[PDB]
Paper text:
The RELATIVE OF EARLY FLOWERING 6 protein (REF6/JMJ12), a Jumonji C (JmjC) domain—containing histone demethylase, specifically demethylates H3K27me3 at its target loci. REF6 has intrinsic DNA-binding ability and specifically recognizes its target sequence (CTCTGYTY motif, Y = T or C) via tandem zinc-finger (ZnF) domains located at its C-terminus.
Further analysis by isothermal titration calorimetry (ITC) between REF6-ZnFs and the DNA probes with or without 5mCs revealed that 5mCs lead to great reduction in the binding affinity to the CTCTGYTY motif.
Residue numbers in the entry: 1265 to 1353
The structure:
Amino acid sequence: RNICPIKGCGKNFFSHKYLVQHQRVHSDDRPLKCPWKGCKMTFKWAWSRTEHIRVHTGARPYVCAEPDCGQTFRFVSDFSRHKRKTGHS
DNA sequence: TTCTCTGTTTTG
DNA sequence: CAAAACAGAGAA
Ligand SMILES: [Zn+2]
Ligand SMILES: [Zn+2]
Ligand SMILES: [Zn+2]
């Protein structure tokens, strides 16, 4: 059940197909590029590029819906943290 | 505190 | 199913 053979990893995964995608963690290729002009950042994961672009645009797309909370967040993990701490949503 | 990562879940 | 997103971890 999908064990990574690489030395000092040995993680096990929910699926074989992820086990293969996971291998990009053990290579130094960074195939994704930031589209913002001049920025040299590169990525391995598409979500990482997505969140990163918000650093350029300044957006805060995560908007707490709890009545009268009004807080907003740039990064998904920070919105998750707020939910977990407050019980909002 | 801001932000990148990544294993898993959700969406289409 | 593949793509998009989430949730939590945690580097800096
Ligand atoms: Zn591995
Ligand atoms: Zn960039
Ligand atoms: Zn809230």
